Design a protein around this nucleic acid. Sequence first.
DNA 1: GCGATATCGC
DNA 2: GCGATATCGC
Lengths: 71, 73
Amino acid sequence: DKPKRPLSAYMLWLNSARESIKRENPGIKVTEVAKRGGELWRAMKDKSEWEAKAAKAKDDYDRAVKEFEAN
Amino acid sequence: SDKPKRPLSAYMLWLNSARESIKRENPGIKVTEVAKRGGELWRAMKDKSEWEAKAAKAKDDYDRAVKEFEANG
DNA sequence: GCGATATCGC
DNA sequence: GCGATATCGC
Ligand code: NA
């Protein structure tokens, strides 16, 4: 099993912000959540927390890649 | 990424076999809804025994598969 | 990961 | 507790 690609900083945030978006948009569609998630993401000026996490997730992915390639 | 895949539970064997059925009975049903629906059918199923035997047999093939894999140590 | 259900302890 | 096990976009 080849490692799945790492979660992006965008997706890391979205996972954490999905209930919030749904609370503020009752009955909202998965498709519309994505569009909304993008509005909030483009608006969020300080993405440091998510960029920091995506950075480590990248490192983890790299290590899983290392382990998958050599044995 | 080479050892035997863990054997499937009675519920997963049933769902895998019923998925396409559930999907055609609810056109467009999403996977999360197929799962939701799976839980419903499973909690209500009168007799799981056939599914449990299949799960038990999958476990046996698995335990066997694991002995072969660890046979040379 | 998560959403959506449900087991099992390589 | 959680990832694996199925599924499968996001
Ligand atoms: Na249950």
